[PDB]
Design an enzyme around this catalytic site. Structure first.
Site, PDB file in Angstrom:
ATOM      1  N   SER A 197       0.871  -1.175   0.000  1.00  0.00           N
ATOM      2  CA  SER A 197       0.000   0.000   0.000  1.00  0.00           C
ATOM      3  C   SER A 197       0.908   1.225   0.000  1.00  0.00           C
ATOM      4  O   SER A 197       1.837   1.268  -0.822  1.00  0.00           O
ATOM      5  CB  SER A 197      -0.975  -0.085   1.144  1.00  0.00           C
ATOM      6  OG  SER A 197      -2.105   0.719   0.846  1.00  0.00           O
ATOM      7  N   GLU A 324      -8.854  -4.888  -4.667  1.00  0.00           N
ATOM      8  CA  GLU A 324      -8.142  -3.840  -3.972  1.00  0.00           C
ATOM      9  C   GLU A 324      -9.067  -2.781  -3.428  1.00  0.00           C
ATOM     10  O   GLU A 324      -8.687  -2.066  -2.491  1.00  0.00           O
ATOM     11  CB  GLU A 324      -7.136  -3.173  -4.906  1.00  0.00           C
ATOM     12  CG  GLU A 324      -5.998  -4.056  -5.390  1.00  0.00           C
ATOM     13  CD  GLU A 324      -4.906  -4.141  -4.373  1.00  0.00           C
ATOM     14  OE1 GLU A 324      -5.180  -3.876  -3.180  1.00  0.00           O
ATOM     15  OE2 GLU A 324      -3.774  -4.469  -4.766  1.00  0.00           O
ATOM     16  N   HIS A 437      -7.288  -5.691  -0.117  1.00  0.00           N
ATOM     17  CA  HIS A 437      -6.108  -4.871   0.098  1.00  0.00           C
ATOM     18  C   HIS A 437      -5.464  -5.226   1.416  1.00  0.00           C
ATOM     19  O   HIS A 437      -6.090  -5.103   2.468  1.00  0.00           O
ATOM     20  CB  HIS A 437      -6.524  -3.417   0.105  1.00  0.00           C
ATOM     21  CG  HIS A 437      -5.392  -2.445   0.021  1.00  0.00           C
ATOM     22  ND1 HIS A 437      -4.549  -2.377  -1.067  1.00  0.00           N
ATOM     23  CD2 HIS A 437      -5.008  -1.449   0.860  1.00  0.00           C
ATOM     24  CE1 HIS A 437      -3.677  -1.397  -0.883  1.00  0.00           C
ATOM     25  NE2 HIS A 437      -3.934  -0.818   0.279  1.00  0.00           N
TER      26      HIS A 437
HETATM   27  O1  IUM Z   1     -13.732  -8.982  -9.141  1.00  0.00           O
HETATM   28  U1  IUM Z   1     -13.238  -7.096  -7.882  1.00  0.00           U
HETATM   29  O2  IUM Z   1     -12.976  -4.960  -7.428  1.00  0.00           O
END
Ligand code: IUM
Ligand code: IUM
Ligand code: IUM
Ligand code: IUM
Lengths: 531, 531
Positions: A197, A324, A437
């Site tokens: 990140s 993400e 994420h």
């Molecule tokens: O298979 U989706 O931000």
């Protein structure tokens, strides 16, 4: 005497930590800078004055003042990222995990944590280097850097608060590692900086900052890159946000000196309390105090730099997670709740796309919606939900990282691109958020290896492949062991654009990660917005 | 006395024509207007002065002066559209096919031919109403209208060449049909105007023109609609093109009177020779003299009219062919040849998209390319070739027709939407061109029914379904026979947007014809170009 390390800064006494079967040496809370407290808040890090005596490197350092997520109190899913040590402006400390016995010169991996530049600690459970140091016999460094206003307030003129000061924190840890990792058995000539990140964005920025390229060998970038839309502001916007932060604390903002003085008297928590009020936009996946493109740390714009090849040319291993965007949607976008399959209405989709792309005009928002709507089915709540995740994930991490990969590979000495798409079996977040994420981190740090964590065997397997990919890449600049039973991870070329899946199913190779969408985000939408 | 028809214009003697088993009455070359020759070139049609004696309605009329395709001389595929009778400015004639025995009041279908408003004849083999009149017992009228500069030169001020004069030709044929079809056994209260390409655009324009709505009951629009980007110019652009046409013939263009006078002395072929030089753009699927949005025929812009419901509210049956674009690409776009699988390079694709969307800026061309490129495979010659066909077909007929369907269905008394995707077994054009613009016509006119034509049985089947769909719709406003063994052709609603496939496989129902792409062409790209 194993745990007695005598460094250029002074003697350091660490501690044996149990890891899996064995034990490992741990040195925790080594100071690498003078506490950035008092008149030194917002100032460039000052190198740590050497200490008399032995430094007790046996407990985790203070974490840096930061926003604490209380959105889901008690929920491990969110608390796993929250500061787990006492917060303090005094927090410029790094952590080293060394094998037993001490290697003589083995690879170093320096972890730089994410947290959108407003949060992060070296000390979280998921950043414990025990497992990685043990399993792969790497010296593993966690660093600390000032986050939020404390690390990234940017009154560009002033010497008392230029921006990027939290990046300089990182650079000083990297200096200390360069200067002293040898005494822990680490090879300064092959330290690999990895991060996730804003951590991967940071890693990208040291590839870019002339002042940093000499201090590491290789780089791993997880779900972040220096050119990410959330990772830098202009010096002007930095000043704007700095002043607005001072306006929130009723600072006299007649002069930079007046402002900085006021901001220096405020308790750390008051800066944190008003921190999110300075964003210029109703927005998702934007943070208030991020690096400033300031002329010093970055010589010019990142795009020029990527274009000219003005960056450290080495090998990079980088990649993204599948979903993400879901993390930020859950937190910031209407209609996404933790406890519902967050089917998103059309009204909430347009609210979401407007939040995701805050800098975009009605034309740009239309372009985004055109791209991401299933027009055969434009009211399907699942397709709207996933599409939002895609918009957020593509705009904010996947497509900027692919831009960076493409520009970088033109000049670099090797690029490996993964696509992590494994949902952990024991993931505490809802199913709809997907491969979230940050949730490749536990696999990079070998948490599937501790049985009490309730990972599957297949997941432990994946964690060992990833750690082996990561440390082998760190040692060698290639994640592949030379002639091994595993299948080879293709280089990313600008020609073929190959990249691998990372999950428990056996490696598959693909081309052109989200190219249709990244052509939109990287090429078309900017051209549209400039017109 | 079967072939002796006594009409308000005078007696008309026709001829028995053999059709399939039986015979049918044919009345060919009935004049419906005074020859638009001499001082009457470019003038509004003048109603035909009634004749003494019997009119020999037994041979096909002259076709109107028009461009003759010599691109593939001898190739039936292109010559089937070329004038097959002697060309003459004297050409305002209609053709009537009547059953034997003469019906008393049965449905009328008035065919209006396409040809981009620069070409077309009532008399081509594929427009022979024998088969349709016989099979479905409809009185079938072919009309003639002035095409090219002779029908659509538009010096808006002048009374001697206002535009739309070729549309007025159509309207006068429609008047004559209204006034006299009864004597052929036709029911003026239920005449259905159908047409293809500019013919369907024309049909749409009589739905729109107040001056025309009363003269027909229902409408079928094949691969054209009044709002098609190629079907109208502003009066300003009409004037511009009129003047440029005069500039090509070295006319004194001091005044409209001077220009029109000069254009009136030129032989018909000299207008035709320079006709394509007046386009404002390097372009595909644009014609020089098209209807003008002039304030008289169209009261205002077509979009306002469609928006306000300012159109004849009836039932329409309309639709498109799958590969609408390939015809124009073969003729106009680099890289498409008749005799090669016309795999299109990337350089030729961008040449093609620039030709297809001539009014678009670099931003718009980028938007189009984004939409239509397979970015996983952007150099695949097939995908580039087909994509061009899609761009041309969507921009030029499918998406404007879907816009028109949507706007019209808000106010109309019924909409049936087909999608013809059958490639004729005996199609003489290459395979790559697909289901080509215009090649549903032979199925509408029942040519699969003549065995010497080498259609499959399954195709004869399809032709009978289409003719039955078409004539049943003409009779009843619904293509479906009430409670029949065939499956029902859904109404097109703005809610469900249903439409049927037309091919030999049994009817399938679908939703939202090319909606993802038509949202681009109808909603997004215009918004982009205005900005
Ligand atoms: O298979 U989706 O931000
Ligand atoms: O604390 U003062 O410029
Ligand atoms: O032939 U004069 O106006
Ligand atoms: O233009 U086509 O499948």
């Amino acid at each position: 005497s194993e745990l007695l390390v005598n460094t250029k800064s002074g003697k350091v006494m660490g501690t044996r930590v149990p890891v899996l079967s064995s034990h490992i040496s741990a040195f925790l809370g080594i100071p690498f800078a003078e506490p950035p407290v008092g008149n030194m808040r917002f100032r460039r890090p000052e190198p740590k004055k050497p200490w008399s005596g032995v430094w007790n490197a046996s407990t985790y350092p203070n974490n840096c003042q930061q926003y604490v997520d209380e959105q889901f109190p008690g929920f491990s899913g969110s608390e796993m990222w929250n500061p787990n040590r006492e917060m303090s402006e005094d927090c410029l400390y790094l952590n080293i995990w060394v094998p037993s016995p001490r290697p003589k010169s083995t690879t170093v991996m320096v972890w730089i944590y994410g947290g959108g530049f407003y949060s992060g600690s070296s000390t979280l459970d998921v950043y414990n280097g025990k497992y990685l140091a043990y399993t792969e016999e790497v010296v593993l460094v966690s660093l600390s850097y000032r986050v939020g206003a404390f690390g990234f307030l940017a009154l560009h003129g002033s010497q008392e608060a230029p921006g990027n000061v939290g990046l300089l924190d990182q650079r000083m840890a990297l200096q200390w590692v360069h200067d002293n990792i040898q005494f822990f058995g680490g090879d300064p000539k092959t330290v690999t900086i990895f991060g996730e990140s804003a951590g991967g964005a940071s890693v990208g920025m040291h590839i870019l900052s002339p002042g940093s390229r000499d201090l590491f060998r290789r780089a791993i970038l997880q779900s972040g890159s220096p050119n990410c839309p959330w990772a830098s502001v202009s010096v002007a916007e930095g000043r704007r946000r700095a002043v607005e932060l001072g306006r929130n604390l009723n600072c006299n903002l007649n002069s930079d000196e007046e402002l900085i003085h006021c901001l220096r008297e405020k308790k750390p928590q008051e800066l944190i309390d008003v921190e999110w009020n300075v964003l210029p936009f109703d927005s998702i996946f934007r943070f208030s105090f991020v690096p400033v493109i300031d002329g010093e740390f970055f010589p010019t714009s990142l795009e020029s730099m990527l274009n000219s090849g003005n960056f450290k040319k080495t090998q990079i291993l980088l990649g993204v997670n599948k979903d993400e965007g879901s993390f930020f949607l859950l937190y910031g976008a209407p209609g996404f709740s933790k406890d519902s399959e967050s089917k998103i209405s059309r009204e909430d989709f347009m609210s979401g796309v407007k939040l995701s792309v805050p800098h975009a005009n009605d034309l740009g928002l239309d372009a985004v919606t055109l791209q991401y709507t299933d027009w055969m089915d434009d009211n399907n709540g699942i397709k709207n939900r996933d599409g939002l995740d895609d918009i957020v994930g593509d705009h904010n991490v996947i497509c900027p990282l692919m831009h960076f990969v493409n520009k970088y590979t033109k000049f670099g000495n090797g690029t490996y691109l993964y696509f992590f798409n494994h949902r952990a079996s024991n993931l505490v977040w809802p199913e709809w958020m997907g491969v979230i994420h940050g949730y490749e981190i536990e696999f990079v740090f070998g948490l599937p290896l501790v049985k009490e964590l309730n990972y599957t065997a297949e997941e432990e397997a994946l964690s060992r492949r990833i750690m082996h990919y990561w440390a082998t890449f760190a040692k060698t600049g290639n994640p592949n062991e030379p002639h091994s039973q595993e299948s080879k991870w293709p280089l990313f070329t600008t020609k073929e654009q190959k990249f691998i899946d990372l999950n428990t199913e056996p490696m598959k190779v693909h081309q052109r990660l989200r190219v249709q969408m990244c052509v939109f985000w990287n090429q078309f939408l900017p051209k549209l917005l400039n017109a």
